[PDB]
């Protein structure tokens, strides 16, 4: 038996199928990530993503920042994390404005591995991306606040 | 046993969704309503851009203009007497 096979059976598509790319564990894992919830509202996805990211973002700012050895470490670090959340929300926003026209339909795939048709991800639309960004901002700030609370209150 | 179809150019060029799942929302319904009502104002990209830029600038200006001396050495200023220059210059 062999381990590496052409991507979805097609040997002339520029990829390969390996345990890293396609195995039950990783497939299940990725398919259950908020980014790949292709049938749910992009808003909620945004909330999850932003929540997790702001939450992790609080960490390195607090301990590595310039005020790490001061009584005002948590405030400073968390504020900085919120700042990066805002900036990244700005980035996401301009990405959405530049990539999708309000009229243009979804650029997401409309097929599955099996080859059957399905509803394209509304994440790849103007409105959908705008919702996702709103979720990243709300969830981002919320996550920063929550992490700060757990760490210093 | 072929991979070329004019009627199906999608499968021909591997335009597949490798990890996208058609599953319904697994999220908390109450929290879903909470976020769908409270995070709504930020779902308009133009308004969100204006809010993030103006609000961000305003916040930055606030924390900057009111920064304590115990945080920024630049606001605390010099605390030691000045040293004279190389050629007796102030």
């Amino acid at each position: 038996y062999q381990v590496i096979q052409p991507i979805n059976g097609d040997p002339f598509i520029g990829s390969l199928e390996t345990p890293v790319t396609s195995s039950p564990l990783i497939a299940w894992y990725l398919s259950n990530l908020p980014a790949y919830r292709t049938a749910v509202s992009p808003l909620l996805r945004g909330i999850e993503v932003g929540l997790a990211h702001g939450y992790l973002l609080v960490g390195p700012f607090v301990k590595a920042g310039p005020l790490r050895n001061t009584e005002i470490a948590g405030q400073a670090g968390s504020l900085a994390a919120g700042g990066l959340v805002v900036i990244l929300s700005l980035c996401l926003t301009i990405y959405g404005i530049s990539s999708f026209n309000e009229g243009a339909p979804s650029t997401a795939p409309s097929l599955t591995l099996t080859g059957r048709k399905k509803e394209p991800d509304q994440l790849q639309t103007a409105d959908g991306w705008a919702k996702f960004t709103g979720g990243f901002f709300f969830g981002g700030i919320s996550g920063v606040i929550w992490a700060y609370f757990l760490l210093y209150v | 046993s072929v991979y070329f179809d004019l009627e199906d150019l999608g499968n021909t060029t591997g335009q597949w969704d490798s990890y996208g799942s058609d599953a319904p929302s697994p999220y908390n319904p109450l929290q879903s309503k909470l976020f769908e009502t409270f995070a709504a104002p930020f779902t308009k990209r133009g308004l969100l851009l204006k809010f993030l830029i103006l609000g961000g600038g305003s916040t930055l200006a606030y924390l900057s203009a009111t920064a304590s001396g115990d945080i920024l050495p630049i606001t605390r200023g010099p605390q030691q007497p000045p040293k004279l220059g190389p050629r007796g210059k102030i």
Binding site: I94, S98 | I53, G56, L60, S64
Partner: peptide, 29 residues
Amino acid sequence: INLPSLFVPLVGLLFPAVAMASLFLHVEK
């Protein structure tokens, strides 16, 4: 020292952000 605390972050952070975003959108259109 009063004004610099206002104008420096304004020109060093806000201005280039606004300008870069604007130019990005302009060039991408």
